Amino acid sequence: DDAELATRAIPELTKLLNDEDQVVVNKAAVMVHQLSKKEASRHAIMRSPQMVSAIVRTMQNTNDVETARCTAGTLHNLSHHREGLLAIFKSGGIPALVKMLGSPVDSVLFYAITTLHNLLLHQEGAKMAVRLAGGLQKMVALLNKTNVKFLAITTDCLQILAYGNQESKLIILASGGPQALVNIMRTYTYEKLLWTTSRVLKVLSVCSSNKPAIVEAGGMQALGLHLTDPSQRLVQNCLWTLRNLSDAATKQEGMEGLLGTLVQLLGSDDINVVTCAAGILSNLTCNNYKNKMMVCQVGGIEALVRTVLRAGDREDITEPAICALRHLTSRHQEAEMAQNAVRLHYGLPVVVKLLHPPSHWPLIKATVGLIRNLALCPANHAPLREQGAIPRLVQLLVRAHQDTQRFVEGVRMEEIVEGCTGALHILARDVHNRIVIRGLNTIPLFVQLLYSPIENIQRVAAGVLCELAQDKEAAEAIEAEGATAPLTELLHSRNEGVATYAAAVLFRMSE
């Protein structure tokens, strides 16, 4: 092989590169490049600190595109070896290469970004080095190029540098990262680039700065395009990102495509896919009635009821599935259809079951909120009674009220007291439900709740009592508990619900 010749050549070629004649520099740059193309002589170049330092200074300071291309090309080749990568680093190559990410030669940009890529992965010190040389700003600026292989390398450098570095995330945000990354997701079909870009947006999705910029750049809809891709890793990184973003996207429009796919993904064999879909749907159905309607239009109620059945005790599925059903069963034109659909798709038994152990407080709290909504539909009154909702709602209520007189699993018991009394307020619309509720000897507790300093507890207590006091026997029980005392104080409340309900109970107890 060459070997011998390569070594004797380097010393001369180094001197030629540092020459005044920019024609001699250029012919040297070309033969240096050519040597770098054979393993024999490539090892020669990497052994020579002076030669590598000469290549980095030529590239950085040349005006021949040919010698920019050739010198960068040489660094590309050196960067495939341990000796070469350390050489480039020690020769101050990282600042040089970052300068070359402003080149208006495509071959130079390619060689530059691949070299920095090999350094970021294979040379300790290079991540901090590239960051301090302003590599992020240069790389985000390059996200407007159109070569899918180049972009795949650029987005991969951005992911490496953004990961667990909150300054780099803010630099990517401040340089216009999110808009560029979203634009990639809705232009290119190249799986490696889409995947790498989805992984960048994932790192950024947990940053409370970037999160809203990604959503406003139209990132929900763009990531949405890819949820039915053949590539698992693409779909999964998109799902994870959407989940991270979803709580900031409740006010986005044009989300019908997404919501349709998420209802379809509830049916996945992969329980991770089902769980992310449930959580995203939970968030996007949060106070947005267009979303609530769209999810109902595409079989959402049935699909969620089936997720809850499928999930069993796995509370990571049931909590967001139940919150979604809760959001879908209230405050939108199709809330009444949904309340019926839960019953017709055999949801009521599983829903009432989830009020019991082993359910934890957050699921029980969501389940109470849902039962409260389901009970707005009169056709649910008897079914819910028959599944024993009422005695279990009263048992939760008493415990919460006893617990509050000294909270648990990241839920306030004051919150269980409101929910349960609210659900009982609505169920109490049915005369058979009222007989059961009275039968549990609850009127004394309801009256003590009128002494709660919490407006919302005052309102539901006065609420259920107002329903009970329809019937002579209850109106007499309520009066006998000295309810007129707190009720006439709640008369003069700033809260409309409280004062309106207080007045109703009082009227139903008067001469």
Binding site: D247, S282, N283, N287
Partner: peptide, 16 residues
């Protein structure tokens, strides 16, 4: 991780 935030009648599960 996950944080629960009530938004009037409805709730948000904030996922990192």
């Amino acid at each position: 991780x996950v944080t629960r935030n009530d938004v009037x009648p409805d709730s948000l599960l904030v996922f990192x």
